[PDB]
Amino acid sequence: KADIAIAPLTITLVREEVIDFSKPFMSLGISIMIKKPQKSKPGVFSFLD
């Protein structure tokens, strides 16, 4: 149905069994998403801080 796919498709072993793949253009990995640490209320711990 298509000729070539230019899209972020994950290159796996089970997808090599039917089609081919070129070399990766951009490497990546699994990351950690947290919020930015803003100013939190320190409270009673501020006296001997």
């Binding site: 209320k41 409270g43 009673v44 711990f45």
Partner: protein, 169 residues
């Protein structure tokens, strides 16, 4: 003699009335998403006129303890009940003062109730984190009148103690 006692009595009555007005309404003011007043129990906006209990305690363990103290106004309500108990003790000691030692304990409980009301004012100021209400200033004025009434009460107590020490010799 009795004039200073009547002045202390009406000062305690005025401090209790201003504490009641501070419990009642218009303690603070906060611009919500237009200004809105609050009296440590419910909030009222300036739609305009609707009132609801906005004292929702949920949305370290010391933060949860501070939230539990700021919730339901545990300090100033018990402070006002202790002021009522001290006023009842002063009214019971004003008529037929048989024992000359209950006035000292009543004044000590009155000063401790004022200190607890100041601690509750510190809690209510710390939990606020824009303007302020008039009942907060009324509660501060009642705290000043309570401090002066405690000073006058212990002054009359040491005068009565000096009179008893002079008559006992």
């Amino acid at each position: 003699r009795g004039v200073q006692m009547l002045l202390t009595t009406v000062g305690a009555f005025a401090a209790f009335s201003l504490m009641t007005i501070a419990v009642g309404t218009d303690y603070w003011l906060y611009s919500r998403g237009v200004m809105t007043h609050s009296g440590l129990w419910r909030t009222c906006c300036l739609f305009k006129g609707l009132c609801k209990q906005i004292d929702h305690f949920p949305e370290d363990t010391a933060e949860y303890f501070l939230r539990a103290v700021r919730a339901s106004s545990i300090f100033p309500i018990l402070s006002v009940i202790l002021l009522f108990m001290g006023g009842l003790c002063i009214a019971a000691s004003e008529f037929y003062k048989t024992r000359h030692n209950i006035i000292l304990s009543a004044g000590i409980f009155f000063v401790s109730a004022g200190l607890s009301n100041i601690i509750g004012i510190i809690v209510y100021i710390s939990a606020n984190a824009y303007s302020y209400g008039w009942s907060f200033y009324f509660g501060a004025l009642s705290f000043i009148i309570a401090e002066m009434v405690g000073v006058l009460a212990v002054h009359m107590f040491i005068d009565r103690h000096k009179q008893l020490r002079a008559t006992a010799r």
